[PDB]
From a paper:
Succinic semialdehyde dehydrogenase (SSADH) belongs to the aldehyde dehydrogenases (ALDH) superfamily and has been identified and purified from mammals as well as from microorganisms. SSA is then converted to succinic acid (SA) by the NAD+/NADP+-dependant enzyme succinic semialdehyde dehydrogenase (SSADH; EC 1.2.1.24). In Escherichia coli, two genetically distinct forms of SSADHs had been described that are essential for preventing accumulation of toxic levels of succinic semialdehyde (SSA) in cells. The gabD gene encodes a NADP+ dependent SSADH (EC 1.2.1.24) and is located in the gab operon.
In the present study, we begin to address this problem by determining the 2.3 Å X-ray crystal structure of SSADH from E. coli. The structure of E. coli SSADH reveals four monomers (A–D, 481 amino acid per monomer) in the asymmetric unit, forming, like other members of the aldehyde dehydrogenase (ALDH) family, a biologically relevant homotetramer with the 4 monomers related by a non-crystallographic 222 symmetry. The L-shaped molecule consists of three domains: The catalytic domain (residues 256–439), the cofactor binding domain (1–124, 146–254 and 446–471) and the oligomerisation domain (residues 125–147, 472–481). In each monomer, the cofactor NADP+ is bound to the active site giving rise to a binary complex, whereas the structure of the N-terminal His-tag was not resolved. Importantly our structural data permits unambiguous placement of the entire NADP+ moiety including that of the nicotinamide ring in each active site. In our structure, the NO2 and NO3 of the nicotinamide ribose interacts with E385 and K338 respectively; while NO7 of the nicotinamide ring binds to the backbone of L255 and G232 of the catalytic domain. A key difference between these two enzymes is that human SSADH utilizes NAD+ as a cofactor, whereas E. coli SSADH utilizes NADP+. Significantly, our results show that E. coli gabD gene product is inactive in the presence of H2O2 and can be reactivated upon addition of DTT.
Numbering used by the authors:
A (entry chain A), B (entry chain B), C (entry chain C), D (entry chain D): 1 to 481
The structure:
Amino acid sequence: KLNDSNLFRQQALINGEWLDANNGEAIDVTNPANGDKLGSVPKMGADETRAAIDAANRALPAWRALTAKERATILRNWFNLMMEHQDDLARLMTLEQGKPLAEAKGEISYAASFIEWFAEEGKRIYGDTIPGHQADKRLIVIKQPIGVTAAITPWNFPAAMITRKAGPALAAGCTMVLKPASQTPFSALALAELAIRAGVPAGVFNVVTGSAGAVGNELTSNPLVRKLSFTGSTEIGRQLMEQCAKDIKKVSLELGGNAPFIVFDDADLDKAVEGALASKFRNAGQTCVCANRLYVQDGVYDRFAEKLQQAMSKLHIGDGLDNGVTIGPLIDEKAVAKVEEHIADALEKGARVVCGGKAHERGGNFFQPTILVDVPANAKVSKEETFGPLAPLFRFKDEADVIAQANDTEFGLAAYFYARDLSRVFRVGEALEYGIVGINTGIISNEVAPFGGIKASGLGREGSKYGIEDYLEIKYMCIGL
Amino acid sequence: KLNDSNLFRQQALINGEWLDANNGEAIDVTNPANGDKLGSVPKMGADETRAAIDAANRALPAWRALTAKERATILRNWFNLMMEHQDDLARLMTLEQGKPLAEAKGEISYAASFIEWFAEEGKRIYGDTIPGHQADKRLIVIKQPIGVTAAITPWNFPAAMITRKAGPALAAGCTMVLKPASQTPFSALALAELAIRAGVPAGVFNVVTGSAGAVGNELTSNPLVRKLSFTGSTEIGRQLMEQCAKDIKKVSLELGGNAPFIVFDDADLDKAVEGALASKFRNAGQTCVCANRLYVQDGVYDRFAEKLQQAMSKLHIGDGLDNGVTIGPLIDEKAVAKVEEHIADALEKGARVVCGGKAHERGGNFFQPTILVDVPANAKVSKEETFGPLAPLFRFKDEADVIAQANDTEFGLAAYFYARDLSRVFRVGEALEYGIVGINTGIISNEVAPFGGIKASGLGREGSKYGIEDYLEIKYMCIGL
Amino acid sequence: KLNDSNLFRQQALINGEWLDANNGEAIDVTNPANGDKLGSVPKMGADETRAAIDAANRALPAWRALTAKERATILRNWFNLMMEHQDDLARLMTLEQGKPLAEAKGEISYAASFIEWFAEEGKRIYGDTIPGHQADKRLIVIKQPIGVTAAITPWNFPAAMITRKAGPALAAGCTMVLKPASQTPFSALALAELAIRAGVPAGVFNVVTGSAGAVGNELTSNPLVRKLSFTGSTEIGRQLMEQCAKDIKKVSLELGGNAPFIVFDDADLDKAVEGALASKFRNAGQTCVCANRLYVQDGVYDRFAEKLQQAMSKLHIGDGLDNGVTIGPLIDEKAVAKVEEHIADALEKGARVVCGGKAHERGGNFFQPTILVDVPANAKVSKEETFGPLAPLFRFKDEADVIAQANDTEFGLAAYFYARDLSRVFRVGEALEYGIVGINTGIISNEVAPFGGIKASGLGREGSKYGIEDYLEIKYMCIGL
Amino acid sequence: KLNDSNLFRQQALINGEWLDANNGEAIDVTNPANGDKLGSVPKMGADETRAAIDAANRALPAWRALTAKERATILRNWFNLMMEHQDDLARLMTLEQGKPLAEAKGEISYAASFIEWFAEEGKRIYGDTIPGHQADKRLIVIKQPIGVTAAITPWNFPAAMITRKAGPALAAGCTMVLKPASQTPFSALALAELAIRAGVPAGVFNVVTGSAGAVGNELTSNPLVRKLSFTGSTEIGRQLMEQCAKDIKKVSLELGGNAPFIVFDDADLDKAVEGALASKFRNAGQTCVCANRLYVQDGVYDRFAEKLQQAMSKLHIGDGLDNGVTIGPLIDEKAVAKVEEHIADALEKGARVVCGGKAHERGGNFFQPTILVDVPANAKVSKEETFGPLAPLFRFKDEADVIAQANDTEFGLAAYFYARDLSRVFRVGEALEYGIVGINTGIISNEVAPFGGIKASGLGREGSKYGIEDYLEIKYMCIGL
Ligand SMILES: NC(=O)c1ccc[n+]([C@@H]2O[C@H](COP(=O)([O-])OP(=O)(O)OC[C@H]3O[C@@H](n4cnc5c(N)ncnc54)[C@H](OP(=O)(O)O)[C@@H]3O)[C@@H](O)[C@H]2O)c1
Ligand SMILES: NC(=O)c1ccc[n+]([C@@H]2O[C@H](COP(=O)([O-])OP(=O)(O)OC[C@H]3O[C@@H](n4cnc5c(N)ncnc54)[C@H](OP(=O)(O)O)[C@@H]3O)[C@@H](O)[C@H]2O)c1
């Protein structure tokens, strides 16, 4: 398999040391395309996690004390190494998580861009001087690393989730203990390996593998951890925020979404269809910003449905390492069951399957890209994140009406719409209750803009100048002359 | 009492209406100097709070839709009214909370400044344009009001605590339901009255008085509330943050502090003493940023102690309405009990009373300005928040030792130090784990600088350009050409 | 006359004293509507200007040394006084410059807004801290007043031109010597009077009246003057910039414009006509941002021309003090002469007058609002600033053609266009070589956005956070630990 | 000689082509250490410069149209190449300009950092959105490249002067025509060569060699050039600013300095001496920020003078290619003469040579580091830029006195002072009329902070987030809904 075999790691990284769990237990990792065992990863608990936090704390003063340029040098080394080893990293990711190799290569590039961006940002952590309240007073604001930080990351973007958190943390001058998804830990550990090679000192970046709560409970209850960042389900987000209350930790969360994708009568339809295909079926729909509800205005509903159906039959389901495959398997059978459930629920409420609608002939974790039409506003899918390759099409008549429908949810991460009228664009863009709004495009991803949710969708922002804020503390100094 | 009798309110403000509780129950409010009943306020519960939230929700679109200048006009009217009625407002505050009239006048001025500052800041909510990731993409960031907000405020700064939250909320384009302290609600309600007179529309700013549980539980559990701001004890902060997890609310907290006040060998000792007197004994020590631990270097310990004792003998205890009174009573008998406990604890651990030491001859809520020496680091008085006119005094050797001692706490709000050497000032200023650092000054309060805590001391900042951020949501728009 | 007779001043203000010229010579000021003498102002020269500069220099340390808040108090007093005396100030302006009373009241309000805006901005002059290049280095940037400043202002906006320069100068902590237009000096002197009443100290703001080059030569050659701001003709801009080279003065310039006004096929035509009317005929076309060239796409040319002609009928010419008058006289005979020359030049090159086109029946400085068609691109009116009620109409074919035509000029001040298509709006908005671009609106004026030109049109910006920059010097401080 | 022989170029670079002058005339370049001919560069004039401007103009749309990241990729390649070829570039520079090899290597590294920094800054050109003046208005500010730019650079920092201007220009999206110093053109042309290798397209960066005004007259009179940046003498700065007035060009200037270096009673003397040695004798005192006047307080004057004299023994004069040489030759005989003239005027006015005092035994351009004492304020050296290894020592009594003396000059570039007292540091730091202030350090150079002068010392800033502003135009767009 790999050009560089040392990128494949079956041990956790704590304080510069590759280690097994104290008790020797491991978690098996399997290939979602076929069920084959790829390897394993330590099943760590509180004790190893505690040791990792103590290592992060011990390494903090010396990391914090480096110049921004010397941190930038190390981080840029990390970035360069990621790009150098791109092919191996992509292969590793396809094997453990399932997405097509081209998608995985794209993710490596995107993931790496966070390391580069924040290396640069670290040199631009600006304080302020503020005109004084009295002639004999001087006011200075500085921004300093929050300290030891914890990160919990999901399985759907096994590389980019890491770098979206480690990038700003390390560039801020913080240290980090990261717990990657048990289903896709290899990508995280490979990045850890490249961090060593880049010159990241022992204890500055630690990767601890184990079962959800064992590691997580220690991360949220240890007062040395001053900041937690989590990406995943809304329910676990709730529990983690509750747990963080004891120490009044600063918490960043990127949670559930239920993205509306809105096509107005004045849209460029071919572009809407391309946007919809890219937005819905990226990572087989296993994305927090995937179109989950497709609202199409009555004037263009029939034409759009036809074009979308034409475009969808062109997708190739298969093993993500094979030529021309554009839809891989879902992560597990639990993901499949949810897609199945959403389809059944839409049917019981009067929707019609136009195409797909069932598990793929391959079985296992493979599901057919599917289109539902005549989907009513009371359907589960209208309220609940699908996380799979299902396009449900909601009809609409009126702009005010669709805005009300789009916003009628506790979530508020990404939304998309297609329209050409300037005034319409402003009205809809402004009225949508979402943290991210794609306008005439289905692909919004980059490292330079703030990515995050409002409402039940989360707290804080990732990427951009705003992204590093969450890892800093403001200090106000008032000097008496 | 008052020049304008209509400033004294004994009813809550909901949706522009002055109301009693539905069940007509009231909370009595007494004068802490003597125990006299001043009046009462409604004892509202979930029902009235719910109705207030619904009013704030209803009022939000039209408030949000005003220009920043028209919001500024209304807020500047409120500011001007506060300053016009300064004398009445100060009197009202002295009567209900106890502080000397001059301190109350000072607080009105400071409280009002937040309204003015944020009126101005509202016009300066700047979005961004960011260079695109592709030639056919445009990136725009806008900042919009988070929506309906809740505020819970304490008794120690009965006017400033209101304006530090209502100012940025309203200027951001949010609406607000505020629950003021049951011991000092009149200040809040007078401000409410002036908000009506200023042109603040019905439902934009609501003040609900009642039991903490009954009002607070509704604030934290109603999903229409998207943001909570609280100032008070660390334990209630923990509970409120837990409760906010359900809706993933944005939370601002300003909590406990245990402020170290550090005097180095090279300090101006007369200035250090002045700063210590101002910092420790302001509001009789009932301040979240009050000096709570006095660290004085070996070389100057004896001289500082002598000078401090000279300066303190000049302190005058009495009714806050009387000439020359500089120490008023504490807020209630439990305030006294805590101070008494901290003394008892330090003595049992081998400390010495240098002056004060017990409850004043007047009795009731009055307490003797107290200094302790020979206090060990594990004493209640040096680990917990005292909120009384009691200071332990510590000797230290050098820079390294005192920094370690200063930072050896779960808190992180304010710290102070006195030194003249430039290098020392940077070293100590940077090393202190506090959100606020006073350097050669004991008074750091203003509206223009970010005020808040790190660690267990809070989340978010109040005042300054950063203050309004906590009430805004960032929206990223990506336009496809 | 006036409600407050002391607003009418016939003396200059130097160092808090109302003075005549040393030689007692005066400049007569006449009413452009009828030629009546209104009064006179001192005809000052180098001597009095030098004394004004010395007074500004002398007052600088104490003005600079005030807190931002105390400068804000004084400037807000000035703002408030301007609004209080709005009616008198508007009357005074209509009498001396000619514009309709409603336009003059509008200008007072707009002029005043600069004083308020900058009073606020003075409190928000932010320095920086920058991460250091070495561990033992600290980098701090502060912004300080440039020092003594000079302002030269034109006759077309006799109040707003003052406040757009004095506002940011005084808020920055600078002092100022201002030379107003000889044709409209009363508005400037009234403002000066209000500055006294507001608490602006002697020598902080001085108004010297006199003949262009005598006062100007002293302003540009005196090394105590560190900054010059000028609004007027391009040719005088060139000369003043040349003169400022000796001392390497910081120079702000707002110069000539030749504003294209572009109407696309997909425009809302009624809104385009309304915008065109407002943009072209405001201040009788005597505005640096007035539509000077009207480009209308082939598909809508005929309809637009018809509608514009209908709308122009409801403009009423007369004395600006009379009810319903919407076009006053031009400033003088020379202005009438330039409009006649533009029309004559157009006609001899094949142009055709649609309506108007001759001096008004009243004579003097009154001119008929005029539409010209068949105007060649080599016509004086398509190349030069007209500053009169003259609307030439240009046909166009496609977007790329009109952009090339709009940009084919040395000027680059304001441009306007009307379109509904989102992509078109971006393409055109981005490609126009102008400092200010109105999109689907003819009225772009406010204090909060940066106003200024590119190319031969000027240097620097007025209004906004960028406006105060031109009156500050950046100071970089590098501290060695 | 060089590792990479193609770095040594004897032709100009215009539109991607290496060219001789139209008339084949060349300028000889000699080694200042011995007078040897190194080679020559074209003696170009108006015609070639005009062709270069046309080439820059032609290349602008496609350079402007790239994404910020693709410009960053090209610029980072340039940076990397500079660091890769550091040894050759350093050698080339030492040969043509004379400075020690270690100084030259340091300049290459410093010069390269501007290219890196601005590559990063280009991705961070932020526009704004501003809250509207009316509910139906939206305000957007964008920042766009100013267009074709011209740069004129001096001989003292033959690499860093180029990159300080080309860096921000190209990162802004501008194109550039650069005229390097005729005495040190090879460094510029080598950088040009690496720009080709980096992927900088033809016409984006042009280097035209020629003698002063020939090239300069065309740069300043050609209206396609919209921005000029110049570093050199004050007198040429004045002339260039005058010439730029015709087109109202945006002008950046870094001119003469006369840096005061102030040592207070409470300074660390050994550190002051080290700082003074580094500040005064870097590049043999041929730097715009070199200490030119040494003010030492009465209490420490004698001790400082003794220590400075001891330290001046650590200076080793010779060929910059030889081991341990720390002072090279001056640039030419005219430089030697000016130093001899300053010493003579100082002695004529009563000053005394403590050490050195005349040309170095080698002759040619070699001069002895000199200390003067007993220097009066009327000496030329107190008013004029020496640009040579001459340290004059002034005695001062107190703070107010030295501040007044320091500021008593038309210059305002760099100043330095040594003091430990916090209050003193603020007082003096704030009161100094300089763009750059070193505090307890003699070395202030970096790419992250704004570098530039006030008063007659310049316009604009180089390095930092501010550095790019001078190369952008602000565009205000106002959208009507
Ligand atoms: N991009 C996203 O915002 C995102 C990502 C993933 C899932 N989801 C949503 O969640 C749904 C299904 O849930 P899921 O199982 O994939 O995600 P989940 O339960 O929210 O878990 C996400 C990650 O958090 C860890 N985790 C769970 N509970 C924890 C705890 N108490 N303490 C510490 N860590 C804990 C898990 O670790 P283990 O791997 O060890 O179990 C997992 O890697 C999906 O269908 C999707 O809608 C969203
Ligand atoms: N860092 C600085 O601010 C700096 C730098 C250099 C000099 N100086 C000052 O000037 C003195 C040295 O004299 P200098 O002859 O080197 O100074 P200068 O006359 O200002 O020359 C500086 C550079 O600008 C070029 N130049 C001069 N006039 C020009 C014009 N009209 N158009 C276009 N380019 C023009 C020259 O090119 P050519 O080589 O082709 O003649 C030279 O390389 C020093 O003693 C110092 O005080 C200061």
